[PDB]
Scaffold this active site. Structure first.
Site, PDB file in Angstrom:
ATOM      1  N   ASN A  56       4.713  -3.901 -17.261  1.00 45.44           N
ATOM      2  CA  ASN A  56       3.804  -3.254 -16.203  1.00 45.44           C
ATOM      3  C   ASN A  56       3.647  -4.600 -14.974  1.00 45.44           C
ATOM      4  O   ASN A  56       4.354  -5.688 -15.240  1.00 45.44           O
ATOM      5  CB  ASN A  56       2.186  -3.207 -16.983  1.00 45.44           C
ATOM      6  CG  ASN A  56       1.340  -4.535 -17.380  1.00 45.44           C
ATOM      7  OD1 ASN A  56       0.143  -4.207 -17.843  1.00 45.44           O
ATOM      8  ND2 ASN A  56       2.095  -5.652 -17.403  1.00 45.44           N
ATOM      9  N   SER A 337       8.061 -14.081 -17.765  1.00 46.95           N
ATOM     10  CA  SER A 337       7.232 -12.887 -18.167  1.00 46.95           C
ATOM     11  C   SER A 337       7.046 -11.945 -16.934  1.00 46.95           C
ATOM     12  O   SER A 337       6.250 -11.201 -17.091  1.00 46.95           O
ATOM     13  CB  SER A 337       6.003 -13.345 -18.615  1.00 46.95           C
ATOM     14  OG  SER A 337       5.276 -14.376 -17.538  1.00 46.95           O
ATOM     15  N   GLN A 341       7.933  -6.945 -12.556  1.00 53.04           N
ATOM     16  CA  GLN A 341       6.970  -6.890 -11.473  1.00 53.04           C
ATOM     17  C   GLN A 341       7.504  -7.771 -10.121  1.00 53.04           C
ATOM     18  O   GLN A 341       6.960  -7.320  -9.105  1.00 53.04           O
ATOM     19  CB  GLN A 341       5.739  -7.507 -12.068  1.00 53.04           C
ATOM     20  CG  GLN A 341       5.493  -8.709 -12.429  1.00 53.04           C
ATOM     21  CD  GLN A 341       4.261  -9.141 -13.141  1.00 53.04           C
ATOM     22  OE1 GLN A 341       3.790  -8.320 -13.986  1.00 53.04           O
ATOM     23  NE2 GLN A 341       3.630 -10.169 -12.857  1.00 53.04           N
TER      24      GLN A 341
HETATM   25  C1  LIG Z   1       2.883  -8.807 -20.489  1.00 49.72           C
HETATM   26  C2  LIG Z   1       4.078  -9.293 -20.076  1.00 49.72           C
HETATM   27  N1  LIG Z   1       4.286  -9.708 -18.757  1.00 49.72           N
HETATM   28  C3  LIG Z   1       5.049 -10.445 -20.997  1.00 49.72           C
HETATM   29  O1  LIG Z   1       4.733 -10.200 -22.313  1.00 49.72           O
HETATM   30  O2  LIG Z   1       6.129 -10.919 -20.737  1.00 49.72           O
HETATM   31  O3  LIG Z   1       7.357  -9.713 -20.568  1.00 49.72           O
HETATM   32  C4  LIG Z   1       8.777  -8.864 -20.648  1.00 49.72           C
HETATM   33  C5  LIG Z   1       9.908  -9.453 -21.622  1.00 49.72           C
HETATM   34  C6  LIG Z   1       9.413  -9.548 -23.127  1.00 49.72           C
HETATM   35  C7  LIG Z   1      10.635 -10.260 -23.999  1.00 49.72           C
HETATM   36  C8  LIG Z   1       8.349  -8.907 -23.547  1.00 49.72           C
HETATM   37  C9  LIG Z   1       8.181  -8.800 -25.095  1.00 49.72           C
HETATM   38  C10 LIG Z   1       7.552  -8.282 -22.670  1.00 49.72           C
HETATM   39  C11 LIG Z   1       7.687  -8.298 -21.417  1.00 49.72           C
HETATM   40  N2  LIG Z   1       6.698  -7.481 -20.572  1.00 49.72           N
HETATM   41  C12 LIG Z   1       7.011  -7.522 -18.972  1.00 49.72           C
HETATM   42  C13 LIG Z   1       6.143  -6.894 -18.249  1.00 49.72           C
HETATM   43  O4  LIG Z   1       5.021  -6.192 -18.856  1.00 49.72           O
HETATM   44  N3  LIG Z   1       6.423  -7.267 -16.967  1.00 49.72           N
HETATM   45  C14 LIG Z   1       7.341  -7.719 -16.543  1.00 49.72           C
HETATM   46  O5  LIG Z   1       7.352  -8.043 -15.144  1.00 49.72           O
HETATM   47  N4  LIG Z   1       8.253  -8.467 -17.111  1.00 49.72           N
HETATM   48  C15 LIG Z   1       8.206  -8.352 -18.411  1.00 49.72           C
HETATM   49  N5  LIG Z   1       8.862  -9.102 -19.438  1.00 49.72           N
HETATM   50  C16 LIG Z   1       9.943  -9.998 -18.942  1.00 49.72           C
HETATM   51  C17 LIG Z   1      11.208  -9.317 -18.434  1.00 49.72           C
HETATM   52  O6  LIG Z   1      11.719  -8.761 -19.825  1.00 49.72           O
HETATM   53  C18 LIG Z   1      12.177 -10.239 -17.885  1.00 49.72           C
HETATM   54  O7  LIG Z   1      11.626 -11.168 -16.891  1.00 49.72           O
HETATM   55  C19 LIG Z   1      13.350  -9.518 -17.003  1.00 49.72           C
HETATM   56  O8  LIG Z   1      13.892  -8.514 -18.129  1.00 49.72           O
HETATM   57  C20 LIG Z   1      14.322 -10.615 -16.933  1.00 49.72           C
HETATM   58  O9  LIG Z   1      15.508  -9.731 -16.171  1.00 49.72           O
HETATM   59  P1  LIG Z   1      16.845 -10.790 -15.875  1.00 49.72           P
HETATM   60  O10 LIG Z   1      16.577 -11.810 -15.119  1.00 49.72           O
HETATM   61  O11 LIG Z   1      17.800  -9.649 -15.394  1.00 49.72           O
HETATM   62  O12 LIG Z   1      17.499 -11.138 -17.225  1.00 49.72           O
HETATM   63  P2  LIG Z   1      18.081 -10.313 -18.482  1.00 49.72           P
HETATM   64  O13 LIG Z   1      17.500  -9.082 -18.892  1.00 49.72           O
HETATM   65  O14 LIG Z   1      17.947 -11.455 -19.472  1.00 49.72           O
HETATM   66  O15 LIG Z   1      19.738 -10.218 -17.898  1.00 49.72           O
HETATM   67  C21 LIG Z   1      20.500 -11.032 -18.001  1.00 49.72           C
HETATM   68  C22 LIG Z   1      21.808 -10.449 -17.811  1.00 49.72           C
HETATM   69  O16 LIG Z   1      22.938 -11.476 -17.667  1.00 49.72           O
HETATM   70  C23 LIG Z   1      24.015 -11.130 -18.495  1.00 49.72           C
HETATM   71  N6  LIG Z   1      24.502 -12.192 -18.961  1.00 49.72           N
HETATM   72  C24 LIG Z   1      24.100 -13.581 -19.494  1.00 49.72           C
HETATM   73  N7  LIG Z   1      24.920 -14.665 -19.640  1.00 49.72           N
HETATM   74  C25 LIG Z   1      26.334 -14.006 -19.105  1.00 49.72           C
HETATM   75  C26 LIG Z   1      25.847 -12.653 -18.790  1.00 49.72           C
HETATM   76  N8  LIG Z   1      26.991 -11.610 -18.448  1.00 49.72           N
HETATM   77  C27 LIG Z   1      28.231 -12.173 -18.277  1.00 49.72           C
HETATM   78  N9  LIG Z   1      28.446 -13.598 -18.774  1.00 49.72           N
HETATM   79  C28 LIG Z   1      27.537 -14.554 -19.362  1.00 49.72           C
HETATM   80  N10 LIG Z   1      27.841 -15.505 -19.835  1.00 49.72           N
HETATM   81  C29 LIG Z   1      23.228 -10.248 -19.665  1.00 49.72           C
HETATM   82  O17 LIG Z   1      24.087 -10.018 -20.578  1.00 49.72           O
HETATM   83  C30 LIG Z   1      22.382  -9.321 -18.850  1.00 49.72           C
HETATM   84  O18 LIG Z   1      23.197  -8.187 -18.387  1.00 49.72           O
HETATM   85  O19 LIG Z   1       6.182  -8.825 -20.144  1.00 49.72           O
END
Ligand SMILES: [C][C]([N])[C@]1([O])=O[O@@-]23[C@@]45=[C]C([C])=C([C])[C]=C426N2=[C@@]4(C(=O)[N]C(=O)N=C4N5[C][C]([O])[C]([O])[C]([O])[C]OP([O])(=O)OP([O])(=O)O[C][C]4O[C](N5[C]=NC7=C5N=[C]N=C7[N])[C]([O])[C]4[O])[O-]2136
Ligand SMILES: [C][C]([N])[C@]1([O])=O[O@@-]23[C@@]45=[C]C([C])=C([C])[C]=C426N2=[C@@]4(C(=O)[N]C(=O)N=C4N5[C][C]([O])[C]([O])[C]([O])[C]OP([O])(=O)OP([O])(=O)O[C][C]4O[C](N5[C]=NC7=C5N=[C]N=C7[N])[C]([O])[C]4[O])[O-]2136
Lengths: 363, 363
Positions: A56, A337, A341
């Protein structure tokens, strides 16, 4: 005597970042070849992050702390809106987001992006928490990557499974490589990035018609979230284990996640009880993060590498020698993380760097 | 109306243990199908241990501490002797083994197995260490597994890539499964073994005509070994990181390993210097160990599983229900640093358990 492309690029990595970057480049008329260990068909591989995401759109930073991240998020939201008609993104209407305090709401920066943004009354929050509600978007992470790969096929991009150990192996048929290797950036000679780090995420995939998303960061002892995805399923989380590489399922974490998600929304179960939750899969993925934030920038490098450039260089350290060319390496890794997005906006910035490098260095 | 086999078995796992077990079963006339995520062609996959081994024969336990291990080692040595003529094993003549003290020589239990066993003079040991020399054996780990797989092909065994999350998925077309899943045993519902643990091993693969093996456990701050293998290459080690899942190459570990191995034997280099070492690859594998030692035993299990058998069972905990059959699960995992050197003997014990189970439970 045919006219061949003078716009060849290699993309190293086939997670959401490499795919998105490849796609914008292919649309711009570059001849793209994707080299990667893990490809979009590898939907249960723990050696890359992309199969495991919710995925998301949940901003995690203030504008001041994360200016690029916000730019990238805003751009990707627009793209995902465009994907709703064909089912590649889904609205999560009336998403609920809980925080420990006002600071955790990040200055509300995204309130013009997610429709219907407003505060929640305390009666609608966990005790002692604060909250907002809004309409956000999600994608089915593995299926989204497979979508991008079909789009790439049509635009003439090709794919090849390869595991690279040293940069010259990627500079195969192109003088510019996009490095979208996630955690792999630490161990490739000529990249050697010690700042790359995993952030481990365990989840439970559940079968439920629940279409309500809940993001709860109000309990620092228990991260929790419920993320519905296209298809009839919900991802229940979670963990944020910084520096933890453990790929095994923790059974105590299962219990904590399910109990907490049930408190947030009983309809993830048939009958409102832990026992009524229809478990499809227990999952563990490693988010590819980076101390100092995501790396999106272009570097010029001389090949061959020597031991002076990289402690991991292959051959004898005694070398220094051999043919010698300078090439362009466009980094795109460490998205932690937020890789889905941010993916479209990050790809746009990658493609701009590639255009600029082509102007300066590649004729 | 054809006469079909009444001796079908599934082997879950295709590392050296699953392969060896499968092969002895196929030779005994069982119809064997191997289900595994990682197969012998996957020679750089970090999601199983077998590609990463030396692999030599170096006992690690006394008879009293490891009676099965010694039995299994003695049997495997005999097998490897038989493989020397065709090049699938290689003599490591005049291997040198150093320990901190007499206790570390394990009561010399294997002195009738390795030819030419004798003490080394202190002049031939690191300062303050004690030592023995003998003739041992090594195999090329990935190529040995590929050999076993060819032998299996000829005997009619088949292979299929599958990642199992719950035991019923393995009981596909057979009522007996051999569980040779290494670390995976912790996260499969119906196995759920929390005692499985990685022991991380980083190595440097070097190009060198050196045919001398040196095993140095005399410095508790620096494990080191030099293991030549069929082919012109030497594996330099090492680490024993108990509970460490990190798959990334540590550059400081590279320096420690190469400096220490150079002290043990300068001929791993062209010119005796670190800079004269021809590095082919930097490697990290996770040995699949188990608190309480390797598990080789047969269990009877009722299917379907319920949440009462496994915290990871799929579906609703609310169940208890459905068809219901009892099957045999023959465990073979947790071999730690000694899976190759124990593999043939362990497989012999697995096959005996399968014969006995067939007599008691399978007609
Ligand atoms: C609420 C949220 N934010 C949290 O929880 O944080 O996070 C993720 C992850 C995980 C583990 C989980 C349990 C969950 C999740 N969910 C989400 C959301 O909702 N939103 C967004 O925006 N994000 C997220 N997350 C994070 C993600 O998964 C990440 O950042 C991405 O996936 C990253 O992408 P990149 O930069 O494109 O990376 P990767 O997939 O790991 O791929 C890499 C590539 O390259 C290759 N390699 C390596 N090394 C080497 C190679 N090739 C050739 N040679 C060598 N040496 C591999 O295989 C692949 O293709 O959240
Ligand atoms: C000196 C020495 N000893 C040391 O160092 O220790 O070690 C090794 C390892 C490593 C890592 C290294 C670095 C080294 C080495 N080397 C060696 C020698 O020399 N010798 C011996 O003997 N050994 C060794 N090592 C160890 C080995 O490697 C081990 O033990 C083995 O490999 C084990 O085997 P196994 O048991 O068979 O296991 P793996 O391989 O891991 O396999 C597993 C399997 O299963 C599967 N799965 C999982 N999970 C799952 C699955 N499937 C399906 N589903 C699921 N869920 C996989 O994939 C595979 O196939 O030394």
């Amino acid at each position: 005597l045919m006219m061949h492309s003078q716009k060849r690029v290699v993309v190293l990595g086939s997670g959401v970042i490499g795919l998105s970057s490849a796609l914008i480049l292919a649309r711009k008329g570059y001849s793209v070849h994707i080299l990667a260990r893990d490809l979009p068909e590898d939907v249960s591989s723990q050696t890359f992050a992309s199969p495991w995401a919710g995925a998301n759109w949940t901003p995690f930073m203030t504008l001041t702390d994360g200016p690029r991240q916000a730019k990238w998020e805003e751009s990707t939201f627009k793209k995902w809106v465009e994907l709703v008609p064909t089912g590649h993104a889904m609205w999560l209407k009336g998403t609920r987001r809980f925080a420990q305090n006002e600071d955790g709401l990040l200055g509300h920066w995204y309130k013009d992006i997610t429709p219907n943004y407003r505060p929640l009354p305390s009666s609608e929050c966990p005790p002692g928490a604060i909250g907002v509600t809004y309409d956000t978007l999600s994608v089915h992470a593995p299926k989204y990557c497979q979508y991008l790969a079909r789009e790439l096929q049509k635009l003439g991009a090709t794919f090849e499974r390869r595991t690279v150990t040293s940069l010259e192996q990627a500079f195969d048929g192109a003088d510019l490589v996009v490095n979208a290797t996630g955690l792999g950036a630490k161990s490739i000679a000529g990249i050697d990035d010690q700042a790359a780090e995993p952030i481990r995420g365990q989840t439970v995939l559940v079968k439920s018609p629940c279409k309500r998303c809940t993001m709860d960061s109000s309990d620092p002892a228990s991260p929790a979230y419920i993320i519905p995805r296209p298809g009839g399923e919900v991802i229940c989380g979670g963990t944020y284990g910084v520096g933890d590489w453990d790929l095994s399922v923790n059974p105590e974490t299962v219990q904590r996640i399910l109990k907490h998600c049930l408190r947030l929304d009983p309809t993830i179960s048939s009958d409102g009880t832990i026992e009524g939750i229809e478990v499809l899969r227990h999952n563990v993925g490693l988010r590819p993060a980076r101390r100092g934030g995501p790396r999106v920038e272009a570097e010029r490098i001389v090949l061959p590498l020597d031991r002076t450039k990289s402690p991991l260089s292959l051959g004898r350290g005694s070398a220094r020698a051999a043919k010698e060319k300078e090439v362009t390496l466009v980094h795109a890794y460490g998205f932690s993380s937020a890789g889905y997005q941010q993916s479209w906006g990050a790809a746009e910035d990658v493609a701009q760097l590639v255009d600029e490098a082509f102007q300066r260095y590649h004729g």
